[PDB]
Design a protein around this ligand. Structure first.
Ligand SMILES: *[C@](O)(C(=O)NC1CC1)[C@H](CCC)NC(=O)[C@@H]1[C@H]2CCC[C@H]2CN1C(=O)[C@@H](NC(=O)[C@@H](NC(=O)c1cnccn1)C1CCCCC1)C(C)(C)C
Ligand SMILES: [Cl-]
Ligand SMILES: [Cl-]
Lengths: 301, 300
């Protein structure tokens, strides 16, 4: 029993972390096989972060302008290339600690573990979600760029995030491991508005199912709703629309608990109307939206 | 910016986890140097001395991945089994065994069949339980802190209590709390809130720009402790005040000034507001956890 914000064990990722220095900029890189991946803005100066011409800056660099440190060992850079907003440094050594891995681009609502690192060394591991507005609510200080997000379903590491910047509201933006930003963001210091964030409805329902599995029934009611009436109400609380895909996805937790998906929707509608009235669900006084249907089945079964 | 429930990096501990099988019971062991540690209840179907006498070394199946370890010795220490093996763990980190106090936090590496499955942060509750997340097969999962490349092992998981909270031992097999490794009736005591940790988390909030709950008021240790008692909060000691000293100095909010904030929150509630995305007063971050996370301390 119990229900925690549970991260993946970080060891497979810790053995991939290195420090990358170009100029006076030091940040983290990810060493897989004979390639180090890091944010391309490691090549930028103070005098040019508004409108950097990355192609013009990179052509001016030598392999020897990149200092790559794995523990107290310098790796030899024998080549460099840019893929979207990630820099790929070819190095003379394959990482002997390279795990089984893949690169996956995730959808809003998906969860992943972050290993927050400084100077190529890990500080901590925590759980995050890709917000509907394509930010993440991370915990990152200066130096954390090149920290990664990952899942480890079944001994294979799925890299899904690389950290690049903090927005003025204190939330975070970054790329997949192909260097494509999540959301409308660019690696420039120009002003860039994050969309209004919304609550991940399918995740809140998954968590209510986790609560029932763990023996909490207080918030259930005798009512049902149509999907369309649910979405009309939930939109008024800045909840994401629930789609038929989401209803299908909740089918197995519905089967395990014997509570129909649109019956649980009616419970959520009442909780938005009433609040908790001094009660808690799985030790929270708020409706939690950073557990996916898959995360609930992983932790509860 | 940002403030998350952050665990220690788990890599040093992942390389120590093994599967222990005795008869029909499979659970987790911790492999350090040439010894595997696990709950003594692995030998059960209790008179532990007697049950153990009847076991030869080959009764204990220890697997480190798909490699069998050879057991050459077995002894009991309190409620832990120590299995001597013929090979030292070449992945043994710098470590020590420590016994923590109620209110102290640590990371749990939840494991099944000797395989790490997840990591989370929790606190030893004032009632000596932990609010963990554990299914059948999780016994022998361990809790730990890291302090500059040294792993301090503090917890080994033994059982779930009827309310769904968890009980276990230090790595010398001494239970936290008034629990026994027996199928008899046992209950979590009334729990209380870890006051010094709530104050640390309000400092984390202020560092992260969440300031609405701050007020002009200050209090006394004596006046606040009468309010703490009233709200089933642990007493705040002068040592706790001294421990929050760095956060007082960094934020400009003295501890008894923050206590007057906490009094108002206990008396009044949060009036529809949140702190660091919580509608509850969070008590599973220590002062050291807040300094750690907000200053970017790393592990070697
Ligand atoms: C990272 O590269 C790093 O760890 N570097 C090691 C120390 C040497 C670093 C992480 C900093 C917290 N990231 C950055 O420096 C990035 C790079 C890459 C893209 C832009 C630059 C600047 N930057 C930032 O994260 C900045 N963020 C911003 O400038 C945002 N704007 C504001 O925060 C802001 C605040 N008040 C008024 C006006 N603007 C913008 C917002 C829109 C998207 C782009 C970033 C700082 C300010 C350094 C956090
Ligand atoms: Cl996805
Ligand atoms: Cl969290």
């Amino acid at each position: 029993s119990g229900f925690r914000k549970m991260a993946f064990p970080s060891g497979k990722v810790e053995g991939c972390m290195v420090q990358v220095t170009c100029g006076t900029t030091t940040l983290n890189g990810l060493w897989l096989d004979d390639v180090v991946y890091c944010p391309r803005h490691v090549i930028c100066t103070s005098e040019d972060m508004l409108n950097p011409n990355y192609e013009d800056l990179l052509i001016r660099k030598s392999n020897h302008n990149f200092l790559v440190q794995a523990g107290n060992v310098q790796l030899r850079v024998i080549g460099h290339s840019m893929q979207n907003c990630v820099l790929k440094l070819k190095v003379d050594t394959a990482n002997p600690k390279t795990p089984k891995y893949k690169f996956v681009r995730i959808q809003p609502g998906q969860t992943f573990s972050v290993l927050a690192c400084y100077n190529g060394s890990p500080s901590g591991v925590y759980q995050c979600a890709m917000r509907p507005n394509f930010t993440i609510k991370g915990s990152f200080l200066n130096g954390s760029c090149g920290s990664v997000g990952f899942n480890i379903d079944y001994d294979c590491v799925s890299f899904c995030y690389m950290h690049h910047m903090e927005l003025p509201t204190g939330v975070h933006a970054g790329t997949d491991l192909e260097g494509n930003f999540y959301g409308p963001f660019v690696d420039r210091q120009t002003a860039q508005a994050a969309g209004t964030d919304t609550t991940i409805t399918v995740n809140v329902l998954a968590w209510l199912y986790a609560a029932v599995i763990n023996g909490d029934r207080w918030f259930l009611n005798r009512f049902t709703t149509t999907l369309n009436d649910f979405n009309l109400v939930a939109m008024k609380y800045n909840y994401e629309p629930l789609t038929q895909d989401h209803v299908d996805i909740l089918g197995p937790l519905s089967a395990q608990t014997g509570i129909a998906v649109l019956d649980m929707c009616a419970s959520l509608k009442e909780l938005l109307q009433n609040g908790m009235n001094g009660r808690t669900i799985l030790g929270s006084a708020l409706l939690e939206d950073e557990f996916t249907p898959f995360d609930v089945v992983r932790q509860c079964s």
